[PDB]
Amino acid sequence: SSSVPSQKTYQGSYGFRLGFLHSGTAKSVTCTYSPALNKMFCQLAKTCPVQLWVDSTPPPGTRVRAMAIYKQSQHMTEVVRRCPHHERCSDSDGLAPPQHLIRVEGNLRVEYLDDRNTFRHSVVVPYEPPEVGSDCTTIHYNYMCNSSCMGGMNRRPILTIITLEDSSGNLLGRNSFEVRVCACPGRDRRTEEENLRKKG
Amino acid sequence: SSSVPSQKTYQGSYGFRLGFLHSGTAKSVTCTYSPALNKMFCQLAKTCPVQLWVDSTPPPGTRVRAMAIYKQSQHMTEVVRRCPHHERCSDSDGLAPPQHLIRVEGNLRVEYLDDRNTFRHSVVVPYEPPEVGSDCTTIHYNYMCNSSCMGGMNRRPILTIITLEDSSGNLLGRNSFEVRVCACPGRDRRTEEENLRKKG
DNA sequence: GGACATGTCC
DNA sequence: GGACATGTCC
Ligand SMILES: [Zn+2]
Ligand SMILES: [Zn+2]
Numbered sequence: 162s163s164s165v166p167s168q169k170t171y172q173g174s175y176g177f178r179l180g181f182l183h184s185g186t187a188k189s190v191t192c193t194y195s196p197a198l199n200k201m202f203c204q205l206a207k208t209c210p211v212q213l214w215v216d217s218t219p220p221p222g223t224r225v226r227a228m229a230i231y232k233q234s235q236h237m238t239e240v241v242r243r244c245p246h247h248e249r250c251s252d253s254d255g256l257a258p259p260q261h262l263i264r265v266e267g268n269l270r271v272e273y274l275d276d277r278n279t280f281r282h283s284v285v286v287p288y289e290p291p292e293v294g295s296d297c298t299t300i301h302y303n304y305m306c307n308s309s310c311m312g313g314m315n316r317r318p319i320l321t322i323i324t325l326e327d328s329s330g331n332l333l334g335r336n337s338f339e340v341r342v343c344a345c346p347g348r349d350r351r352t353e354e355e356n357l358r359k360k361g
Numbered sequence: 362s363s364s365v366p367s368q369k370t371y372q373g374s375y376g377f378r379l380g381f382l383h384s385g386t387a388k389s390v391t392c393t394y395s396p397a398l399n400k401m402f403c404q405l406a407k408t409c410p411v412q413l414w415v416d417s418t419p420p421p422g423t424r425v426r427a428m429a430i431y432k433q434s435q436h437m438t439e440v441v442r443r444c445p446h447h448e449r450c451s452d453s454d455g456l457a458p459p460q461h462l463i464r465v466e467g468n469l470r471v472e473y474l475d476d477r478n479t480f481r482h483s484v485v486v487p488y489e490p491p492e493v494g495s496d497c498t499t500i501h502y503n504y505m506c507n508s509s510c511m512g513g514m515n516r517r518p519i520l521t522i523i524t525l526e527d528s529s530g531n532l533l534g535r536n537s538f539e540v541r542v543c544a545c546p547g548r549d550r551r552t553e554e555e556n557l558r559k560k561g
Numbered sequence: 562g563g564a565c566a567t568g569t570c571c
Numbered sequence: 572g573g574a575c576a577t578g579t580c581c
Contacts, residue, residue, distance in 0.1 A: 307567090307568080308567095309566085309567060309568075316566080316567085343567070343568085344567065344568045344569075345567080345568080348567090349567080352566095
């Protein structure tokens with residue numbers, strides 16, 4: 162069995178997809194999303210709102226997991242972790258282990274997990290349906306290193322894989338998106354989309 | 362008493378001064394020295410030959426200490442250390458503590474010291490006079506982080522202070538030089554000397 | 562070695 | 572935000 166989680170999109174029976182806020186790139190903003198690249202550009206430890214959309218309501222006890230993997234085949238097998246510098250920075254919120262790249266803020270039932278076999282990190286919260294009048298649920302993620310962090314992601318792109326899972330562990334839905342954590346999300350999104358057009 | 366070692370040049374009664382190899386900058390070389398800037402440019406963990414010159418022979422038991430401090434007044438008080446990434450890299454040679462920035466290679470009597478009061482690191486070897494026919498003694502230093510290392514020197518310039526000390530601890534001589542540890546010593550020396558001329 | 566990268570200065 | 576920085580790609 163593979164030690165690398167599938168990144169394969171699975172809309173599933175509940176019509177699961179992700180949504181992202183608009184947009185830009187007015188200024189080198191804190192967080193911006195490129196539909197063309199399927200890529201979030203954001204800043205170190207800043208809020209990244211991700212929306213969960215479903216057509217049919219998941220059953221009670223459904224959970225939402227986020228996990229990072231390296232996007233490139235050459236790096237897929239390596240566990241995505243915080244670099245040694247940021248790991249020792251004591252910026253923990255009391256819940257997140259200092260090694261974990263991805264945090265969820267503002268959730269009283271967050272769980273941080275480390276796979277006993279793959280050693281990969283993930284963070285889980287309960288799924289909750291939208292309030293009446295709302296079409297989605299929003300989770301605030303934080304990425305606790307820059308993509309460029311020496312001894313950590315080291316300039317390698319990652320994907321965040323979001324899985325919708327029932328109590329029993331059945332996969333109900335899966336989506337994923339590329340992430341670049343950088344100093345200037347607005348600038349870098351512009352640069353990448355222009356290189357896509359010209360050279361892609 | 363100051364927790365910051367003096368960088369004040371002291372040629373002393375023995376006529377102590379430093380010498381550096383020539384030069385460049387043919388290519389982005391591994392190690393190059395700028396007389397105008399009093400600055401060594403070198404690469405991570407590569408050999409940096411430093412020559413010790415004296416007019417009168419130091420007495421037996423004389424020692425040679427190297428220590429780094431931040432050059433800028435704003436950073437002088439902070440101890441110069443390896444970054445967390447390089448510290449944990451297990452590149453130790455069996456003698457140097459993994460936190461120490463400055464190593465001496467090729468010396469059977471090297472001592473690595475940490476000041477009980479200032480916590481500053483230094484590395485010491487016995488002073489030895491030149492062989493007959495030679496005008497100097499050469500020590501091979503290594504700098505085990507780049508100047509840019511996140512969580513370490515963090516792009517701040519350092520000075521290396523070389524002290525000639527007798528057995529008893531008397532200061533016989535002192536010299537110092539700025540260091541930039543970088544990927545492209547040749548390129549950066551050229552850039553800095555040109556900015557000195559134009560803007561200095 | 563030239564171009565590109567990507568965090569920082571101002 | 573433009574210029575500069577500084578490690579990396581090729
Ligand atoms: Zn980091
Ligand atoms: Zn380092």
